[PDB]
Amino acid sequence: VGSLNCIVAVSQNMGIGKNGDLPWPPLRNEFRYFKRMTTTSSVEGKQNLVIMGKKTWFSIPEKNRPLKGRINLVLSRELKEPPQGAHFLSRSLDDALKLTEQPELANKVDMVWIVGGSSVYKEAMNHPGHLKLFVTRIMQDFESDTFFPEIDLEKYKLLPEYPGVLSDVQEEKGIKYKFEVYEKND
Ligand SMILES: NC(=O)C1=CN([C@@H]2O[C@H](COP(=O)(O)OP(=O)(O)OC[C@H]3O[C@@H](n4cnc5c(N)ncnc54)[C@@H](OP(=O)(O)O)[C@@H]3O)[C@@H](O)[C@H]2O)C=CC1
Numbered sequence: 154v155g156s157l158n159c160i161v162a163v164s165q166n167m168g169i170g171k172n173g174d175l176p177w178p179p180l181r182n183e184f185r186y187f188k189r190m191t192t193t194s195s196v197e198g199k200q201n202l203v204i205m206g207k208k209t210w211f212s213i214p215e216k217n218r219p220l221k222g223r224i225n226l227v228l229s230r231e232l233k234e235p236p237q238g239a240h241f242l243s244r245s246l247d248d249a250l251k252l253t254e255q256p257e258l259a260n261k262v263d264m265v266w267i268v269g270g271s272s273v274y275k276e277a278m279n280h281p282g283h284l285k286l287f288v289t290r291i292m293q294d295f296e297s298d299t300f301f302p303e304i305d306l307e308k309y310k311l312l313p314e315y316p317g318v319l320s321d322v323q324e325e326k327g328i329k330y331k332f333e334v335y336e337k338n339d
């Protein structure tokens with residue numbers, strides 16, 4: 154199995170969600186970036202795995218579910234089987250990560266992408282090990298009810314460049330944003 158990664162878009166006030174929707178209006182090229190990054194597998198004959206909480210799964214329009222080209226795993230201790238259209242269900246992140254080492258998945262998964270929400274990010278980010286954060290910085294405040302956890306810059310280094318990631322300021326719908334990559338290894 155390849156790298157472990159979080160990817161998020163987050164406003165200045167650390168906001169990632171409001172009422173099961175994004176706090177800002179649709180940013181089309183930001184969506185394209187999310188798709189490109191989670192879908193592109195560096196290893197032939199493999200797909201990337203996406204891991205997400207139950208509320209993140211249901212936040213995705215039904216037509217966009219499952220995230221296509223990727224293996225879709227949902228985290229839930231209430232659900233007794235994967236949601237309609239999902240591929241796998243786990244009861245914890247450790248369980249999810251453990252499953253990728255099983256007969257069924259060992260050979261099939263390239264990179265793993267944690268794509269939400271708050272508590273799954275939090276746990277991933279404070280788990281020892283080699284981890285990257287792909288963070289799109291939406292450079293305005295937006296009313297939110299769900300937030301990205303604190304990024305501890307003593308551990309997470311902001312990378313000065315990354316292949317495939319634009320370094321300059323982007324702008325869609327009057328909303329400025331920029332792509333960042335962080336890395337820890339501990
Ligand atoms: N801006 C961005 O990049 C992103 C924004 N979002 C947004 O955030 C919101 C959804 O996020 P959030 O509310 O944080 O919810 P989550 O997607 O994390 O879902 C939380 C639920 O998933 C289960 N769960 C979460 N973590 C675990 C775990 N470790 N083990 C087992 N089950 C777990 C739940 O189910 P149960 O009660 O069934 O056990 C728990 O109640 C929406 O607004 C969405 O639009 C989401 C991703 C990215």
Ligand SMILES: Nc1nc(N)c2cc(CNc3cc(Cl)ccc3Cl)cnc2n1
Pocket residue numbers: 160161162175183184187212213214217220268269288289
């Ligand atoms: N950078 C970044 N990181 C994430 N985790 C994101 C996650 C989402 C999830 N939402 C969503 C997904 C699909 Cl495919 C279609 C419609 C919606 Cl609303 C949206 N944008 C994201 N951007």
